[PDB]
C-alpha cells in the first residue's frame, strides 16, 4: 500500500494539472501514472481506500500511496490519455470502435456497482485510454462505499458538482445511487458518440435542470447508430426506479456490439 520512495523515478514533464505526472515504479519496471498533491491530504486517502478494494480490468488499478515531498497516488499509466480528448484529437475513430469503448466502460460500472461503490463522477474525461480498443474507468475522488444497509449515499453540502452529469435525484435530493451513474453513464455516451463534445453546450446548470425537468434531452449526435441513442435516452429516464441498472445497461450494449460486429 505504501511505496518505497527510493524505488519511484518522477519524470519532469506533468502529463496535467494538484498535477498528475509520469513515472516508473521498479518492481521490471512499471510506467505509472502519479497524482501528487489536511483535508486534500483525507481526500487522497479516502481515494486510496475505494481504489483499493476494486479489481476489475476497465477500472484504473492503483499501486499504492508514498509520501514524500507531497503525498502521492501512484496508479498504472493509462497512455492514450482522456477519451474526450482522443476522440476529439482523432475524428475519424469508427462507430464499432466507440461501441466497443463505451461497454468496457459498462462492464468497470457493472462491476463497481456489483461492488457497491458509486463513483459520482462518471463522464468522458475520467475514462482514460490505454489503447484505441481498450478502456478503463479513473479518478474515484467523489467515490463512495455504500453502507451495507443503503442503496444510496446522501451528500450533505452540494460541492464542486459536474451538474450536467447528475441524474434529477442527485440535483434535487443529494441523492447518489448506482442508477446515478447510469444516468451520467448516458451523458458520457453522448459525448463519446459526439466525439469528445461538452454535453449541453452553452447552458448553465440551471437551464440543465429546468430542460430536463421539461422532459428534453439531447439530441442524437451525427452518425450515432439509433439503437446507442434509445440506450442515452433510457439512461436519462427521469424516475429512478424506472431507469435501468448497469446489468441492463452493459447487457443492451454487449449483444448490439456483437450484432455490429457481426455485420
Ligand atoms: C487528465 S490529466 O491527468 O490532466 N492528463 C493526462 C494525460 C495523459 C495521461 C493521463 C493519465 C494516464 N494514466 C492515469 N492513471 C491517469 C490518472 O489517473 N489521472 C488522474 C486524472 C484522471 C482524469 N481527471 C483528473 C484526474 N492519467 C493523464
Redesign the pocket.
Known amino acids: 500500500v505504501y511505496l518505497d520512495r527510493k524505488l519511484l523515478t518522477l519524470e519532469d514533464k506533468?502529463?496535467?494539472?494538484?498535477?498528475?505526472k509520469?513515472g516508473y515504479y521498479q518492481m521490471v519496471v512499471k510506467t505509472?501514472?502519479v497524482?501528487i498533491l489536511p483535508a486534500l491530504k483525507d481526500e487522497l486517502l479516502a481515494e486510496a481506500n475505494v481504489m483499493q478494494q476494486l479489481d476489475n480490468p476497465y477500472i484504473?488499478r492503483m499501486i499504492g500511496i508514498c509520501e514524500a515531498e507531497s503525498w502521492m497516488?501512484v496508479?498504472?499509466?493509462?497512455?492514450?490519455?482522456?477519451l474526450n480528448?482522443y476522440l476529439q484529437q482523432n475524428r475519424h475513430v469508427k462507430d464499432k470502435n466507440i461501441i466497443e469503448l463505451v461497454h468496457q466502460v459498462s462492464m468497470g460500472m457493472k462491476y463497481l456497482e456489483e461492488s457497491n461503490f458509486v463513483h459520482r463522477?462518471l463522464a468522458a474525461?475520467?475514462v482514460?485510454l490505454v489503447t484505441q480498443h481498450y478502456a478503463?474507468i479513473?479518478?474515484f475522488?467523489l467515490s463512495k462505499a455504500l453502507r451495507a444497509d443503503e442503496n444510496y449515499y446522501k451528500a450533505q453540502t452540494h460541492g464542486k458538482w459536474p451538474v450536467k452529469w447528475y441524474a434529477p435525484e442527485c440535483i434535487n435530493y443529494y441523492k447518489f445511487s448506482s442508477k446515478s451513474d447510469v444516468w451520467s453513464f448516458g451523458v458520457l455516451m453522448w459525448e463519446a458518440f459526439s466525439y469528445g463534445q461538452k454535453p449541453y453546450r452553452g447552458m448553465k446548470g440551471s437551464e440543465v435542470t429546468a430542460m430536463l425537468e421539461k422532459g428534453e434531452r439531447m439530441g442524437c449526435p451525427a452518425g450515432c447508430p439509433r439503437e446507442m441513442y434509445d440506450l442515452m435516452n433510457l439512461c436519462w429516464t427521469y424516475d429512478v426506479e424506472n431507469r435501468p441498472g448497469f446489468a441492463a445497461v452493459e447487457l443492451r450494449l454487449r449483444n448490439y456490439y456483437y450484432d455490429v460486429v457481426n455485420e
Open positions: 506533468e502529463l496535467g494539472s494538484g498535477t498528475v509520469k505509472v501514472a497524482k484504473v497516488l496508479m498504472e499509466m493509462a497512455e492514450l490519455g482522456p480528448k463522477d474525461r475520467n482514460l478503463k479513473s479518478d475522488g
